[PDB]
Amino acid sequence: MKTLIVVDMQNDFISPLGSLTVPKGEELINPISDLMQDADRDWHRIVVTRDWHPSRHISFAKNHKDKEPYSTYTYHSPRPGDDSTQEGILWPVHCVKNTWGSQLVDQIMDQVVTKHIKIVDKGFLTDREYYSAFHDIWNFHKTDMNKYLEKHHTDEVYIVGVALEYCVKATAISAAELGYKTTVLLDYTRPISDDPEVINKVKEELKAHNINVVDK
């Protein structure tokens, strides 16, 4: 069956008042809300995801001496004895747990609360980045996502939300790797990068992982 995953539709990403606004992100609120309620889409289940960071999170530039937001940083595997590394971006503080910024945007939250929609939080471990809604960048900690999808007989995963080139892409790739027929509905996503070229690049990467990219 089909599960819709709505990725990180949170204030810090969507509102201009947010600390890490996705350009044109406000355009997604109503259409995604409509998508969630559209019976023609045959959603057996909907899952919404949230970045759920502590203020001391390793991904915030603020928590690093002599490093400013949007700078590059070398992350180190948290497993002891493992010494591999990954290139990453240090960010402005965003989606801190229990703050306005980490709240699902009103219109989505309203749906989640009244329809009792499953929430998956990621990014709460201080020591690592966590783009994918399925597991951290090391594939060390997993969320309950996969188990939830399995319980609910999911064979098709549809992904919408923000940011196209980060949490959306990472979640889509996880879903495909785990054997779900995965689709990204492009029109229901936005990149953080105000660069039109970024859309094409992601499109190609997704297709290379056998993920369907359609507009609507």
Active-site residue among 8, 12, 95, 169?
8
Indicate the pairing of strand 181-190 with strand 72-76: unpaired
Q: By C-alpha distance, which of 44, 17, 21, 41 is closest to 31? A: 41
CA–CA separation, 73 vs 201, rounded Å? Answer: 22
CA of residue 83 relative to chain centroid, distance: 26
Helix axis angle for 169-177 and 196-208, nearest 10°, is: 10
- 76 belongs to an annotated ligand binding site: no
Judged by CB under 5 A, the stretch of 16-24, 52-60, 100-108, 139-147 that binds Mg ion is 16-24
| Binding-site partner at residue 51 among Zn ion, Mg ion, none, CB < 5 to 8 Å by type | Zn ion
- Whether the Cβ atoms of residue 49 and residue 175 lie closer than 8 Å to each other: no
Active-site residue among 2, 12, 136, 167?
167
Judged by CB under 5 A, the stretch of 21-29, 38-46, 48-56, 146-154 that binds Zn ion is 48-56
The Cα-based distances of 26 to 23, 64, 98, 106, 199 in angstroms read 8, 31, 21, 12, 18
**Closest CB to Mg ion among residues 5, 162:** 162
**Closest CB to Mg ion among residues 93, 167:** 93
- 51 belongs to an annotated ligand binding site: yes
Quickly count: other Cβ atoms within 10 Å of residue 130's Cβ.
Answer: 25
- 141 belongs to an annotated ligand binding site: no
Q: Which of 21, 111, 174, 183 lies at the binding interface for Mg ion (CB under 5 A)?
A: 21
Q: Which of 14, 19, 21, 51 lies at the binding interface for Zn ion (CB under 5 A)?
A: 51
Report, in Å, the least distance between residue 209 CB and Zn ion: 22
38 catalytic per annotation? no
Footprint of Mg ion on this chain (CB under 5 A)? 18, 21
Residues that bind Zn ion (CB under 5 A): 51
